[PDB]
Design a binder for this molecule. Structure first.
Ligand code: 5GD
Length: 111
């Protein structure tokens, strides 16, 4: 069902949800619950929410055309966090740490 490149991507997904990175990955596991957090303007500012559970749903449903589309969704997750938050926010620090893991593994993708 999966190309060599999308298997590599599924392995990155597994890595990003693994306990090793939980200290900083956890705000990305589920969709941002704007009402529960009191972020009443989140969905006015962030037009296309993304999180690791959405990515995992897509991967399980074979919805990614290619590894580039997978990378676009993971990068959107991070970009939404940088767009909504100020630069010194604790969740932005977490996003940068998780994104370092993502980009490094993504770069080792096979030809
Ligand atoms: C638990 O998982 C997540 C995941 C997240 O993204 C992946 C976010 C995220 O993007 N932003 C925030 C967030 C941001 C701000 C500015 C904030 O403060 C509003 C009121 N403050 C007092 C008055 C001035 C501002 C609050 C409470 C939460 N929380 C998240 C939690």
């Amino acid at each position: 069902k999966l190309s060599e490149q999308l298997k590599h991507c599924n392995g990155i997904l597994k890595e990003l949800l693994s306990k090793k990175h939980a200290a900083y990955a956890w705000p990305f596991y589920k969709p941002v619950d704007a009402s529960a957090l009191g972020l009443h303007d989140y969905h006015d500012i962030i037009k296309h929410p993304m999180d690791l559970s959405t990515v995992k749903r897509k991967m399980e449903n074979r919805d990614y055309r290619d590894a580039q589309e997978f990378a676009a969704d993971v990068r959107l997750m991070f970009s939404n966090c940088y767009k909504y938050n100020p630069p010194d926010h604790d969740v932005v620090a977490m996003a940068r740490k998780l994104q370092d893991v993502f980009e490094f593994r993504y770069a080792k993708m096979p030809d």
